[PDB]
Amino acid sequence: LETIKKQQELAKRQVQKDMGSQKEKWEKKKLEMIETAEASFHENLAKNPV
Amino acid sequence: KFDDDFYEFRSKIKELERRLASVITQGFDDYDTIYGRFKLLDNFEGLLT
Lengths: 50, 49
Hints:
part of a larger assembly; 2 chains; A: 0% strand; rod-shaped
């Protein structure tokens, strides 16, 4: 039971550490930057045949 | 073939779970105290199927 009790204390710490406020928003900003870079590359790819 | 094995495995897990429900129910009645019954729940806290 003490070992199980210890895991529960760790469980609060795992959620508080791994999950943070606006975690998705930070990920979305990174995705938007990748999309903008990809859009610039696609225009360059379109340019080569023309 | 794996899916067929899964269904056979699914029945085995249910049989395992059914036995656990019976043993768990017998233990809860046996303690006869709120503190004793609660302690058993903490042990099986992560064992709930």
